[PDB]
Each structure stands twice: as structure tokens, then as C-alpha cells.
Amino acid sequence: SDVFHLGLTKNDLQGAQLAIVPGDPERVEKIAALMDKPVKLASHREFTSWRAELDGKAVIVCSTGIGGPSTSIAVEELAQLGIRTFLRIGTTGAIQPHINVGDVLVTTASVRLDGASLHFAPMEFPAVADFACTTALVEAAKSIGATTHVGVTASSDTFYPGQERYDTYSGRVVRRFKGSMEEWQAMGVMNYEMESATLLTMCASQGLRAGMVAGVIVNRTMKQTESHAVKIVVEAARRLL
Amino acid sequence: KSDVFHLGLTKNDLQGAQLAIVPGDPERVEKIAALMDKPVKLASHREFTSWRAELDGKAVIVCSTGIGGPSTSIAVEELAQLGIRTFLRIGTTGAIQPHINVGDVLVTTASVRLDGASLHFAPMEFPAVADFACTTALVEAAKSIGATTHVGVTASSDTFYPGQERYDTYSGRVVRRFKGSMEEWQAMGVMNYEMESATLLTMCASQGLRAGMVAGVIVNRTQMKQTESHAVKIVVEAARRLL
Amino acid sequence: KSDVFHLGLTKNDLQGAQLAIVPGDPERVEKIAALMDKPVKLASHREFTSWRAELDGKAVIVCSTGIGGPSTSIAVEELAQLGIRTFLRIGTTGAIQPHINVGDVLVTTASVRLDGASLHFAPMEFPAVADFACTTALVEAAKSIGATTHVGVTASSDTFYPGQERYDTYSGRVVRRFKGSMEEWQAMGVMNYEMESATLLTMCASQGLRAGMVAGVIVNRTQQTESHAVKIVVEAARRLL
Amino acid sequence: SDVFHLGLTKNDLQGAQLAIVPGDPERVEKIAALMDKPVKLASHREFTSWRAELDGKAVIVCSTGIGGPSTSIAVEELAQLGIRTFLRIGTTGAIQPHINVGDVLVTTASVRLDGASLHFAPMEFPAVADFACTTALVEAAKSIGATTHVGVTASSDTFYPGQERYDTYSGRVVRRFKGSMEEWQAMGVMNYEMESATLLTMCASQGLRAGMVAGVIVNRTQQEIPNHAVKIVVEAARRLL
Amino acid sequence: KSDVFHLGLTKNDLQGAQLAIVPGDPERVEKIAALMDKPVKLASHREFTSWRAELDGKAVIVCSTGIGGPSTSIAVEELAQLGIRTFLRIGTTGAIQPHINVGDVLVTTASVRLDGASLHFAPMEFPAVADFACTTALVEAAKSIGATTHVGVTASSDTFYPGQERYDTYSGRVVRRFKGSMEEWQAMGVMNYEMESATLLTMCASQGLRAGMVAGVIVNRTQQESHAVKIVVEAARRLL
Amino acid sequence: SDVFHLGLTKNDLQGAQLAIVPGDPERVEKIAALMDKPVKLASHREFTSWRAELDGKAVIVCSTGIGGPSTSIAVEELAQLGIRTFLRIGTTGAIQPHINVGDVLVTTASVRLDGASLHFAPMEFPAVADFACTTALVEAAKSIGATTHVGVTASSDTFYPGQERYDTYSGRVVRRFKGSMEEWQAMGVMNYEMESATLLTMCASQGLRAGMVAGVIVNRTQQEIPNAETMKQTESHAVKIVVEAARRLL
Numbered sequence A: 001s002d003v004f005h006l007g008l009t010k011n012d013l014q015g016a017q018l019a020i021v022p023g024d025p026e027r028v029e030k031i032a033a034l035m036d037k038p039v040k041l042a043s044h045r046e047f048t049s050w051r052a053e054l055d056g057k058a059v060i061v062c063s064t065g066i067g068g069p070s071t072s073i074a075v076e077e078l079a080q081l082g083i084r085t086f087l088r089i090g091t092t093g094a095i096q097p098h099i100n101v102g103d104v105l106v107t108t109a110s111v112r113l114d115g116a117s118l119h120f121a122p123m124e125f126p127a128v129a130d131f132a133c134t135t136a137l138v139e140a141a142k143s144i145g146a147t148t149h150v151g152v153t154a155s156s157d158t159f160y161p162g163q164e165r166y167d168t169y170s171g172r173v174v175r176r177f178k179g180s181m182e183e184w185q186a187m188g189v190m191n192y193e194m195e196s197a198t199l200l201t202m203c204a205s206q207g208l209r210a211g212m213v214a215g216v217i218v219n220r221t222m223k224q225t226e227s228h229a230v231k232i233v234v235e236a237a238r239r240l241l
Numbered sequence B: 001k002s003d004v005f006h007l008g009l010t011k012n013d014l015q016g017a018q019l020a021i022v023p024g025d026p027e028r029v030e031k032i033a034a035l036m037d038k039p040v041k042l043a044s045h046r047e048f049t050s051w052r053a054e055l056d057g058k059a060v061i062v063c064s065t066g067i068g069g070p071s072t073s074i075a076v077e078e079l080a081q082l083g084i085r086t087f088l089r090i091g092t093t094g095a096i097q098p099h100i101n102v103g104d105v106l107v108t109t110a111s112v113r114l115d116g117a118s119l120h121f122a123p124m125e126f127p128a129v130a131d132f133a134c135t136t137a138l139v140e141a142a143k144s145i146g147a148t149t150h151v152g153v154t155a156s157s158d159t160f161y162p163g164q165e166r167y168d169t170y171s172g173r174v175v176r177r178f179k180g181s182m183e184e185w186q187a188m189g190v191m192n193y194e195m196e197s198a199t200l201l202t203m204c205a206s207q208g209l210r211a212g213m214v215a216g217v218i219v220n221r222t223q224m225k226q227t228e229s230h231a232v233k234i235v236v237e238a239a240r241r242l243l
Numbered sequence C: 001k002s003d004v005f006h007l008g009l010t011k012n013d014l015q016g017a018q019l020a021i022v023p024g025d026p027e028r029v030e031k032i033a034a035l036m037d038k039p040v041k042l043a044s045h046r047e048f049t050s051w052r053a054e055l056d057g058k059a060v061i062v063c064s065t066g067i068g069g070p071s072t073s074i075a076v077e078e079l080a081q082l083g084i085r086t087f088l089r090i091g092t093t094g095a096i097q098p099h100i101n102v103g104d105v106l107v108t109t110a111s112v113r114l115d116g117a118s119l120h121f122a123p124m125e126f127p128a129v130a131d132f133a134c135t136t137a138l139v140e141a142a143k144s145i146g147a148t149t150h151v152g153v154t155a156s157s158d159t160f161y162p163g164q165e166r167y168d169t170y171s172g173r174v175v176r177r178f179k180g181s182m183e184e185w186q187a188m189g190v191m192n193y194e195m196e197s198a199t200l201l202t203m204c205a206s207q208g209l210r211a212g213m214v215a216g217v218i219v220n221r222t223q224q225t226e227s228h229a230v231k232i233v234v235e236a237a238r239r240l241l
Numbered sequence D: 001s002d003v004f005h006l007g008l009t010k011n012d013l014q015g016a017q018l019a020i021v022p023g024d025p026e027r028v029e030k031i032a033a034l035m036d037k038p039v040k041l042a043s044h045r046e047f048t049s050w051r052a053e054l055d056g057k058a059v060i061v062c063s064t065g066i067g068g069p070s071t072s073i074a075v076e077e078l079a080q081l082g083i084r085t086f087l088r089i090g091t092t093g094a095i096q097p098h099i100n101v102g103d104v105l106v107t108t109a110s111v112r113l114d115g116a117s118l119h120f121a122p123m124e125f126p127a128v129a130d131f132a133c134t135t136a137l138v139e140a141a142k143s144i145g146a147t148t149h150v151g152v153t154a155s156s157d158t159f160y161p162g163q164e165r166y167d168t169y170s171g172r173v174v175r176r177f178k179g180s181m182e183e184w185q186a187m188g189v190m191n192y193e194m195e196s197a198t199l200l201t202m203c204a205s206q207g208l209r210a211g212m213v214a215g216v217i218v219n220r221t222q223q224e225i226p227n228h229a230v231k232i233v234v235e236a237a238r239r240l241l
Numbered sequence E: 001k002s003d004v005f006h007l008g009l010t011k012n013d014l015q016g017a018q019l020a021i022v023p024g025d026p027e028r029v030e031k032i033a034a035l036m037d038k039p040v041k042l043a044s045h046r047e048f049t050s051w052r053a054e055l056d057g058k059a060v061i062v063c064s065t066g067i068g069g070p071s072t073s074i075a076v077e078e079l080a081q082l083g084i085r086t087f088l089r090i091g092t093t094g095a096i097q098p099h100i101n102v103g104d105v106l107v108t109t110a111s112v113r114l115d116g117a118s119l120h121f122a123p124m125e126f127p128a129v130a131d132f133a134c135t136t137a138l139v140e141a142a143k144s145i146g147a148t149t150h151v152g153v154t155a156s157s158d159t160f161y162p163g164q165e166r167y168d169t170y171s172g173r174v175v176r177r178f179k180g181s182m183e184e185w186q187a188m189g190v191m192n193y194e195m196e197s198a199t200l201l202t203m204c205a206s207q208g209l210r211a212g213m214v215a216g217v218i219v220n221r222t223q224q225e226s227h228a229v230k231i232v233v234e235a236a237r238r239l240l
Numbered sequence F: 001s002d003v004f005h006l007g008l009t010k011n012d013l014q015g016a017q018l019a020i021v022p023g024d025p026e027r028v029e030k031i032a033a034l035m036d037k038p039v040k041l042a043s044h045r046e047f048t049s050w051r052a053e054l055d056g057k058a059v060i061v062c063s064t065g066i067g068g069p070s071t072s073i074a075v076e077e078l079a080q081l082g083i084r085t086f087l088r089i090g091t092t093g094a095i096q097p098h099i100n101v102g103d104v105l106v107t108t109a110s111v112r113l114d115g116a117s118l119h120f121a122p123m124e125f126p127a128v129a130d131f132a133c134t135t136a137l138v139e140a141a142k143s144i145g146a147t148t149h150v151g152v153t154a155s156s157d158t159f160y161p162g163q164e165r166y167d168t169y170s171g172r173v174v175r176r177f178k179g180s181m182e183e184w185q186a187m188g189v190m191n192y193e194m195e196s197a198t199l200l201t202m203c204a205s206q207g208l209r210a211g212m213v214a215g216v217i218v219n220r221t222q223q224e225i226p227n228a229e230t231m232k233q234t235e236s237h238a239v240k241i242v243v244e245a246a247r248r249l250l
Ligand SMILES: O=c1ccn2c(n1)O[C@H]1[C@H](O)[C@@H](CO)O[C@H]12
Pocket: A023, A065, A066, A067, A090, A091, A092, A093, A159, A163, A192, A193, A194, A195, A217
């Protein structure tokens, strides 16, 4: 391996310059299988990586695990291997009453409720997605006619207190996050997830292109959801090769 | 008879306008409005000069913000009270990237928040991000006139001098926070400095208003008219797509 | 034409002046200048209108700053380049104390730094404090004409609306930082709100420049003024030449 | 399932109140194998879990994945299922010159270079280990005579820039972390890893007991990446049942 | 006269002492020293009163810190200059858990840093953590002496009043940061408030000095607004 | 005692509304000796208090101990007892080359390098002195005849790393304070001391008047250090000034 965690070499990529990066290792093969010539590359820790082909060009599918820290490892090591464009495809809880389960959300930028993004840029720097990538995702969502919402996502280092969940062991939420969901709602934030702030900040501050699309699995106020978002990211990738 | 404290405008003055182009300098307001139909002066108070015009049958506002986030936040809030829901910032700017030359145009996707006013709308974690539709329209408009365009991040500073790490000053000093900062933004891909976008983009993105920003490059510290006109044609053409 | 980037002034225009009175509104510049000897227009560019006059045979500058720290920081810097060493801000203001009434005059000893520009000169730990000689001159000028004067702390905000906890706005919301903030400043004895002094005082106190500030109360949140605050700033200038 | 991520029910725990939590899903089976009656429970995402028995009491082994965010999910859901004591067994990079690869490091408390700890307690709160757990770990290390060091650990949300690694795609480290390793070294910090700040903070602030131990796999005074602790964590567990 | 600026002590005065017991109150120094052999008064300047004594044949220093991190930081630094490498604070404290009784003994594993001086040694992310051997000696000493003992986190405040969310004050105002804070620390399991441990533990842990912290409960805040001394002496014996 | 630490009652004050607050308990008697009929009231921990009479009015002298935390206790408890005006008198090391030993420093406001101030007001709030107190101190300095500097003071929770001293056990200074003395120098900060940030902030944010004056007994930039009596003649000067200022504030 050329890299410490992923267990991949530059040759494994066969010239790939774009990676699709879901959180769940189990989702990796499902995405690769939608493209031509899917081949498993490696599986270490939460990092499962496959290669496939899109319109004749090699593409990587590599899981990030949950959270900015493992995401930052996958992105860095893929970048070392030659990836310059990253498309995250994830799941998300919506926090706006008008956003229905199964909807598709394209993230323009993220509220940085993580710690890893700070390891790349100070908080003043925007966790902003690449324009080409965001455009490709939006245009891909339109081509398949999905109900799409485009805007800001809150990206949290926790699933529970940072998304102001009280249904927990302690039932306590620290002061910083008490009342935070309503605040994000009033500010027009669409949804919560846990990787985009790190992904977008680390890419935008290092000359890498990143986009973020997600399928709505719950509304904080199903099957064809993932499929739709997954279709969208693969189609978007075609436009970015 | 004004409905707002600073702008000296009433809702009626807007004639149903829902979009405003917002340059910094009052002296540029008529010139922009003059590119559109039936331009008329509305008012002039402090750094807030407003004109109404018409674009493909729809009323549009052109209103200056003055220099800096504080004045901008006043113009934007009061225009919002008056019914504006879409704001397009037009400016001329320097650049901090060597590959960016005078004559190029910059469309800002999001800004580094080196201001104070943005914090009065959203905590620092919140992204000073432009509206997708506005950014799209600005890029496509730049495309239609064949402008050499750069799309990316802009550093938005409450100062012209130390926050842009200028040392040619009275004190010749730059506070620790900003010492070495220009090189840091350069390494992070930041295109340029200006002084209003962090405030504009943050206050709009966190209050359901659409904002975008375009600027012509007139200078570059690492290394004019046409550039300006281009930027202005771009912002007017973009406004047409957003009505 | 100009020794500075924005003001459109040369050192020659100042005729040796070392003190500037700095109102916010360009419209007020001529009025202040008119109270002194030999008043003449200098220049007008953006929100920076400048006049020169004379007191006791010494040149004095009057120059507007525009609204807010950013434009203030430009005016003060460029005036400092041209030789100004003492700055007296004159404003009108809204009081936050029940017993500070319209028509009262406020002299600011130091400001609560609710701005961004002050941080471009000194870290937050540094006091946005007025120069003692300036504050003395203003207080003594105020007493010499019998104004009802309050001396103390001013809250200096980058916004007119949320930073001063105004809810009569488009969104009707105030970010967490500022919710409940007016009552807090009130309990801490803060006199009033305005928008330029944190920047002015900090940038002067941290770079060997003298600054003071006086303001007329023309309204009170908890419920001819110009002429008096203006008379005070000119009489104070007389004492500082 | 009783919880959203782990795919476990309280019944799967068989009354277990202690969990050993490695970062790598592949280490779980190996840890479980050192105990009696090892049984696989589930594997979802980076969360692989096994049950075993120690001195006739059920014990859980469950991986956390890399980083605070996924750790916070595993700990929370284990807590919901009934776990009250958590022993992290990790790998680590030493930052002191005389720590040998293979050495066992027991963490008393962590430098919070993560984001997730802040979702449980403000930064002022110490990421401190439980005294009984730390004691059990030290005493267990003593009983097998491993080379052991006890002290403070820097816990980072990144593998690369937050641990001041420069052999990366960008080769740059953000201002906050430039010169940081030398600083921690001067302060006597022993090592870097990526989970303890979150684990220790979230446990200490919610009435859960946590201990932290790791084997050194690289010495950072010499290189950024490499070309006993497990026995100790199991023995320590015995003492805490 | 004195090898350090504030304490008025010389390296000679310590007679090779490498451990110091550091109470807050100068008036308690003589009392503690008296529990050991050959107690001799050394110096008394400002809030810094110091005695030397002997414990199982070895020199030991007792030196007051005064109230608060700043004065503590001076005493610890200057004692370190004179050769002290182990510091055991013995204090008084208000419990904030209902289950902790007055007269109970609290051993601190780490402190909530509600002080400013700790930041002069390490950034906020660094833990104000006690030395493991010192903490162990205190817990073991507490068994030996016999006392109801709790081991855990302590909130260390730069103020006695607003930082411990006391309202019995001139202004009756508690700043936003501290409004509701006691109940927050309570829910997070914090045992008690005092005013020196965050500075002490942070400055020691970040400078290769060993520090431990024990205190006797003199009030319980959920109700209103000699074991510890024997314990700190016994712990010192275990650390020489 | 009406208060938890000071061992004082309202009766002890005899209607006093002004307190002079040196840091060192040993200085309290010395300052009181500059006034009429001084009597010792109490001594507990670092808090030694005396009452004296100034132009026929009761005045308290009470030590604060070193640092914002003990200072906050003294000021708060004195406020409870009825004190409304506080004058700190210190001795200090200057950091400007032009500020000479023997000079007197009057502080208009302080750089908040302390923790206790934050327990009264967020960092944005200025650690600013009361105008009447500052005026009285400046005027008294002129009555006494001192060479006076008026301006900003850096108020640190430590004597060592926070004042960027490297002559210490570890010989290291945390990142925050590395290079900080040169920064404060460039910003015109006059000196370091350790109580004013807390004092000035807690008073300005609670309707209390506070001023600060100090005698310069050493300069961080100069090689030579005044003899056995670095303070004494200078100390005496600042003390005479704080008493003379108190006269104007009664
Ligand atoms: O509310 C949610 C729902 C889903 N997700 C999100 N928050 O975090 C993302 C994690 O990777 C993982 C955590 O369940 O899935 C994404």
C-alpha cells in the first residue's frame, strides 16, 4: 500500500481522479455495481474501496466511516493517490417541516459543528462545496426529477447531543446545543449529518473539489430514497469526469 | 414619509421590486440603473443612494451599501423590510492569486468571515455562503459575455489595512491574528479580499434571503473601465435571470 | 491630489493640523467646521467629507467616518498618515439607562467591543479605552456649558439592529449571542449604543493616537441636541491643541 | 434492535455492564477470543460487537471506528443498553523520544483536540479518566510486567494535520497546529490518538466510568508513520467487574 | 536572603525538601507542620507563610498559596525553583452533590478550569489533571486515616462569588456565562467548588511537576451557600 | 463579621465609603499611617484591614492579596459593607524604555490577561477605570510632584509566563504569551501588574468606582535594577498620591 489506512496503491486507481464517498462500507459495492467493471480494491477498518468505470473513465468508491475524523483520513489518502474530486452521498435527518422523507438535499455549505474542519482552516473559513460539483448534483437531480432542496446543512460531530436529541442515556444536552435545532431551523438550515463540514472545509482549503448530496431518512419535526440519491451522485460523477 | 430609519424609502417607492443590485459606492448606482429601463432616482441619505429601474417589465432596485459590513447590514435589512428578497453585490476588487489578472471576473461562492457584523446574524460556524441560484446566474451571465471567470472563496475583512495584511501604514504593525494571514488564505485558494460579502452573505443565508456576488479584477498585489463595465453587465444580466 | 488611498487629501491640505473631529455623517462636517475660524472645504470621496478650520490659530480637521468600524478604520488610518494624532468623535445616540434622558450628553471612557474591526488592531483582551486628556477636555467642556453629562461605558455594535437587540426587523429574530444582551449591558451600567467607538478607541489606544468621544442623547430605548454636543466637541478640541 | 446503530438488544448483553472498546472492528474478535464463551453479536458500519465472559460475568467487546463521532455513537448506545464502564484499547503514536514501539500507555486525561467532547462538556471540563479504571489498567500492566507509561494523551480529530504530520497531499499544517507537537512534547504529553478526548469527556460528564490504554505503533520523534496492551485491558476488566 | 522573589526562601532553607504541602491559608501552615517532626518556621511574606518539617527522615515544606490561581502560581513556581517536584494541595471546599456530606474528604482527579492562570501554562484543551501517584497516595492515605471519601472532578473558580453562582452579593447579578452553571456542573458529576486546583494541576501537569489535591467539605451548596490534614500528611509520606 | 472572609462589620467602617486597596497586607499599616487616627480592624488570610480618617472622614485600607481571585473577594465584601469607591495602589515593572524607575503610572484601563474579570463581564467589556478616580489620581500626582504616565496596563494572572518571563523552572512560555511583551510594548502598554483587570472590570460592571496608581520600581527593558530599596522612595511617592487622591473622592 502507498497509504497507511486505505491499503491502496496508485496503480489500484488506474488513473481515477474522482471518488464517490459514502459513509457506510456496506454501501460501497452497491454504488460501484451501478457502474461498469466494478472491482473490489480493499477493506480495512471502516474503509472499503472499490473501483469502477463511468463512460470509460476509472472512478473510486470509498467509504469514510461516520464522522469528520475518519472522513479526513479517507479523503487525504485518496488525494495522495490522485483523487481531486470527491462526491459524498449520505443519509440525513431533515429539520424543516416542508422537507419530506425520501427527498434529496444538495448542500451548498455546512454549519461547522465538527472539530476536524478546524484542523484544516480556522472557523472563519466557509465549509463550502465546489461550484462544479454542486451544479452537477443539482442538474442530475433535475434529470431524474427528484424533489430536491439546495442549501445549508448542519454538520455535527455527534448523532445525539449535537443534533439536540434528548432521547438518550443522560437526557441532557450541553448548553451550547440546548435550543440549537430551533436556531438552525429559523436560519434555514435543511438538515443534520456528520461528515460534510470536514469534507467541504478540507477540500475547499486544499484545492480539491467536493460536493455533497443526501437522501432524507427522517424528519426531525425509505427504500427508494437511497436509490434516488445514489443514482443522482453517479450521474453527477459522469458530468465531473 | 419613509418606512425605514436610514434609506428614506417607502414600500411604494419600490413598485413591487423584489430584487436589488447593491454596489458599495453611491456614485455607481445611477450608472448601473442606466443599463435598465425607466431609471429613476429614489433617495439619497448617508451612503445609501437608491434608484429604481425596470428589467423585462419588472421593477428592480439599485442601492449602495457604503463601505463595510455595518453599513451593508443596514441597507440590506431595510431593503428586506421594503420587500427585497434577492440581493446581488457588484464590486471591483484586487486579487491575491497570481493566476488572476486584471480584467478577470470573480464570482464568490462563500466568504471567509473576517468581519464582525456577520456574527450578529449567525455564529461563526455558519457558512457565509452565496445563494445557489444567484451564483449560477452570475456564472452563466459571465459566460454569455465571454468573461474570464474565477469562482471560489473570497476573504471579507472589516479593515482595508491590517485585515488584508497591509504594512504600509501609520504603525507599520499587523496584529498577531493577521500576521502571515495573506499567505495562509493564498494557500487555501482564496481569490481576493473585499469588505462587505461576509456580512451580506451571512445575513442573507441565515434569514431566507438570496444573495450573490460578482466583482471585476482591477488590481493584483502579488503582481479598470472595461473590467467594471463587464462586471456591471454581468450583474444586470444575472438579475434578469432571477426576476 | 492625494497622499492617501481614500480621503483625497495631501499633508499640505492639513496645514499642520494634528487634531481631527470625526462625526459619522458627512452632512455634519460643515456644521462643526462652521463653529471654528476660517472654515474651508477640503474633499469629499465616498462617506469621507473633510473640512479644515482653525482654533486659537492652529489648524483643525473635521472629517466624517461613515457608519461603522470598517469605514472609520479607513478614515482614522489615513488621517494618521497625514499627521493627525488626536481624534474626537462626535455622535448622536440612544441611551439604554432609564435615567439617561434625551438632551443629555454622554462622554465615553471606554467601549464594549461588539465590533469586528477593533480585533484587526488588538486582541479582545485589550481595552477600547479613550485617551485621558481627550476625555478630560470633553467632560470639562460639557461642564463649562452646563450640559447634563454622563461619563462611562458605551456598547459599540457592528449592527444597528440585532447587535442592539432590536426585534422590529425583517426576521424578528436575534442570534443567541445577542438575545438578552441589552438587559445585561444595562445591569452592567453601559450608557448607550452606537457603532464606531470600539473601532476608533481600540485602534487609537493601540497605536499611540489619542481618542475621545462625546454624543448627544436624542432618544431613549427605555421610554438642538446636535448643537450642544457639537459645541462641546469644539470647545474640547480647543483645549487639546 | 434497541438502538439505532449497533444492532443490539439489552438481551444480547446478558447483563454485561462493562465494554472493551477497540477502534478497529477487526480487533474485536481477537480481544473476545482471550475470554470465555466468545460469541459474535453484530456487525454494522464500523461497529462490530462480540460478547464474552470473564470470571463468570458477561463482557462486551465493541469497536468504535476511528474518531470521536463514531466513538460517541458506540458509547451512547452501549450506555443505553446498560454498559456503565468503558475501557478503550487503542494504538498510538508516541511523541516522547524514549517511548518504545510496543510500550503500553495508560491515559490519565486527554488534550481535547477533538470536536465531539464539546458536545458533552465545555472545553474547561477535563477529559479525565475514571480513577478505578485507570488504577485497574496500571495494576494490570504491573502484574504482567509490561513497559508502561502513565500520563496525558493528545487526542486529535485528525490523523494528519492535528498530529502535525507534514507528509501529506498539501504538506501544510494550519496555524493552530504548526509547532503543536513540540508544545505537547514540552508539556510532557506522551502520545497522540483520536478517540480518548471524546470517550473520557462524554463518560466523565455523564456518570460513566472510562479507562484508556494503547500500544505504541510509531514514535513521532523519528517518523510520521511506521514502516500486550490487549492482555492488560482484559486483565484490567477482570478487576472492574 | 532569598533565592526567589516572593517567598523569601533560599535553596538552603529547604534542606533538600522535594515535596511541599500547599494549603491556601497562611494561618494553617504552622498547624500542618506541627503534625510532623522538627517543625521550623522559615518565612512569612504577603500570603506566603512557609515552614519546614521532617517526615520519615526527609525534609518537607509547608507553604501557603493564598487564595486563587495567581498567588498559587507564584508559590508553586518559586518552590519548584528551589527544588520542589511534588505538590499536595490541602484545602476547604463546598460540595455541590446532595450525597456528599460536610466533613467528607474529596480527592480531585482533575478540575474544571474556571480560572485564568491555567491558560498561562497550557491552552484550554489541556486537562487540569492530577498526578496519578499523588492521587493514589491520597486515596490510600484516606483509607489509612479513615474518612468518607469521594474521588472525582472539581470545579476550580477564579471567584468565590459569581463563578460559584453565588447570589448573596452586592449586585445580585451573575454574568451570563455562570447563570445556571452550578446545576450544569452538578449534572456532569462535579463534586465541589474551590479556587486553586485548576491552576495548580494544570501548571504542574504541563511542566513535569507532580501534583495532588485533597479537601475537606465545609459546606454543601445544595443546602446552603481534621481528616483532610491527616490525610495529606500521610499521602506525603507515601510520596517521599 | 458581616462578611465571609474579611472579618469586618458595617460598624467597623464608621460610614466609610472609600477603600484604598494595596496588594500586600504588610503595606496596609504603612498606607494607613499617612492618615489620621489609624486603627487595625482585622487580619484574616491575605486580608489585612485598617480604618483611618482623611479630612475627618472614615476611610478603609484593605489588602487584596496577589491576583484577581483574592481581589474579587476583598472588593465584593467591602462593597457589601458599604464601600463604593476603590483605589488600588501598587508597585510595578514598566515595559516602555521611556518610563523610568521612580515614575508614577495611572491606569485608564487594563488588558485583561486574567480570569476573574470574565466572572463579571464578557471579554468585550472594557476593564476601564472610573473617570473621577482617574482624575483624582492624576491631580494628586501633580500635587505631589511626580513624573506621571497615564495609559493602559497589562493585568496578568501570573507573574511569570503571562509577563513573558523565561527565567523560570521550565524556561518555557505557552504559545499565547510567546512574543506577547513586544506586542504590548508596540501597543503602548505601560506596565504589567496582577490585579487591575479584575478590579476595574468588576467595579465598572457593578456601579462601583475604581482607580489604579502604581510606583515604578523597575524596568523590564533596562539592565540596572534599583538597590535594596527599589520601592521605598518610589513606593512612598505612589502611596502619598493615592492618599491625596482619596481626599478628592470623599
Ligand atoms: O441524523 C442523521 C441521520 C443520518 N446520518 C447523519 N445524521 O450522520 C450521518 C452519519 O454518517 C450516519 C449516522 O447515522 O448517517 C448519517
